Write a protein that binds this ligand. Structure first.
Ligand SMILES: O=P(O)(O)O[C@@H]1O[C@H](CO)[C@@H](O)[C@H](O)[C@H]1O
Ligand code: BEF
Ligand SMILES: [Mg+2]
Ligand code: NA
Ligand code: NA
Length: 218
């Protein structure tokens, strides 16, 4: 049986992928880049703050100074952090709280494997911190998603091999990171976005311990 579940945060635990999208789009448009639409944003889900800004600048083949790059990333983060102040337990996605409870009852470790430096704050907003055995700090890894490092780190932090773990993700970059870690990915979203080569569920209510078992048994 699997011994850990490695949770992405944004778009898996709660709807904060939507807020990242809205904040990046606002930022892009301030600098005259209009290509950050929902389709493009699939390339930003699960990607670090700095890598995200760089992808936006590349979309338009735009160079900015190092000083401006720093200011832009800070501006978007400040906006995003204001947006999320009112996140509460009511914003936890369906099925997620009950999954955490069921995992703990079955002695399955729970680790966060988010690309976001805002992860700990969000878990606190949602009263979820006590469910997590570890949080892999995305600032500690040498390589961010789609590199597997964050998922490997999350597994190691709870004393479990990646190959005995399930990873839950909503993003192209994160699915690739899970694959390359050795963990088993179960995506949430559209196969049109995430691929037809892993198990994908349409919404998080499908993330039950019963289903994770159904999938692991195969
Ligand atoms: O700015 P943060 O909260 O540190 O982090 C990151 O930026 C990306 C922007 O695309 C999001 O998609 C990530 O999921 C979120 O971790
Ligand atoms: F979207 Be995850 F929190 F990197
Ligand atoms: Mg995500
Ligand atoms: Na449930
Ligand atoms: Na139950």
């Amino acid at each position: 049986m699997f011994k850990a579940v490695l949770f992405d945060l944004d778009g898996v635990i709660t709807d904060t992928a939507e807020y990242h999208f809205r904040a990046w789009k606002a930022l892009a448009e301030e600098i005259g880049i209009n290509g950050v639409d929902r389709q493009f944003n699939e390339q930003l889900k699960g990607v670090s703050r700095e890598d995200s800004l760089q992808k936006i600048l590349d979309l338009a083949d735009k160079k900015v100074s190092a000083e401006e790059f720093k200011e832009l990333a800070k501006r978007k983060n400040d906006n995003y952090v204001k947006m999320i102040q009112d996140v509460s337990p009511a914003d936890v996605y369906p099925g997620i709280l009950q999954l955490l409870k069921d995992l703990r009852s079955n002695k399955i470790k729970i680790a966060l494997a988010s690309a976001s430096k805002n992860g700990p704050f969000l878990l606190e907003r949602m009263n979820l911190t006590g469910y997590f055995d570890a949080i892999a700090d995305p600032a500690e890894v040498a390589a961010s998603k789609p590199a597997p490092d964050i998922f490997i780190a999350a597994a190691h932090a709870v004393g479990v091999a990646p190959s005995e773990s399930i990873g839950l993700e909503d993003s192209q970059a994160g699915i690739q990171a899970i694959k390359d870690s050795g963990a088993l990915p179960i995506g949430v979203g559209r196969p049109e976005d995430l691929g037809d080569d892993i198990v994908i569920v349409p919404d998080t209510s499908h993330y039950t311990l019963e289903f994770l078992k159904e999938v692991w048994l195969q």
